[PDB]
């Protein structure tokens with residue numbers, strides 16, 4: 178329903194998500210849709226970008242409100258007849274000193290980081306146009322958390338045949354295991370945030386197969402990635418790189434040139450793919 182291509186980013190009123198929309202408004206040939214769960218916060222962000230010559234469109238979106246997601250679909254369907262670029266950026270993390278009980282932190286982090294991300298995908302993947310790109314912003318914390326789980330769990334996540342059903346099952350188990358205070362007897366990592374990123378990353382793998390299994394001819398590319406340690410409300414003030422820089426790999430994955438057929442279903446960090454599970458080569462100078 179449109180010959181104009183369109184890109185969309187979740188949780189983009191601030192942080193990396195915001196940075197990503199800026200770069201797209203600059204490097205993407207078509208409309209860029211900035212979304213946010215709060216309209217005021219979201220429109221303000223749009224206004225700020227207009228002050229740079231950029232002109233992105235706005236639309237409300239809370240990836241936790243299934244009804245909010247469906248409305249976006251409607252918007253897209255009618256306005257563009259589909260969607261070309263999707264970047265699942267939105268997320269939360271409970272840091273140190275936050276009183277929230279552990280099992281609750283588990284449940285809420287999972288609820289939006291995995292569940293939310295998945296509900297956006299199941300609803301928008303059908304709308305991705307051929308030559309379309311999908312980027313899921315994960316974290317290397319997922320890999321760290323992956324290596325802390327028991328070899329039995331690691332094997333299940335690293336599987337080539339794991340299903341979307343089994344993945345959703347493992348994520349849910351993790352939450353039940355923490356409420357019942359046994360997740361360690363079950364060989365799980367203590368990192369609720371990390372475990373959710375595992376899910377996002379494995380989910381991307383699974384999605385990559387389904388796409389080539391159900392739409393091989395559509396040349397769609399999908400990958401998960403880590404933007405690095407960045408200065409945001411989530412990253413903290415010590416973070417070495419700024420949002421402008423952090424949005425580099427994600428944007429790169431979003432603009433992969435037409436007909437590339439790779440990378441696909443890969444974990445990308447700093448524009449380079451990284452074997453799933455393989456720990457990070459180095460790490461920034463520590464300034465405690």
Ligand SMILES: NC(=O)C1=CN([C@@H]2O[C@H](COP(=O)(O)OP(=O)(O)OC[C@H]3O[C@@H](n4cnc5c(N)ncnc54)[C@H](OP(=O)(O)O)[C@@H]3O)[C@@H](O)[C@H]2O)C=CC1
Pocket residue numbers: 187188189190191192193194213214215218238239240241265266267268269289293314315316317403404405406407408409410411412413416
């Ligand atoms: N910062 C870092 O060092 C790293 C970040 N990442 C990943 O990058 C992504 C963005 O990180 P960062 O920029 O620091 O994040 P921020 O915490 O600065 O921003 C997160 C954004 O997601 C939004 N959001 C949270 N929950 C929801 C929801 N339910 N529906 C819609 N939007 C929501 C926030 O909304 P609102 O403003 O209204 O709260 C916000 O716009 C995340 O996926 C994160 O895990 C990965 C590795 C490192």
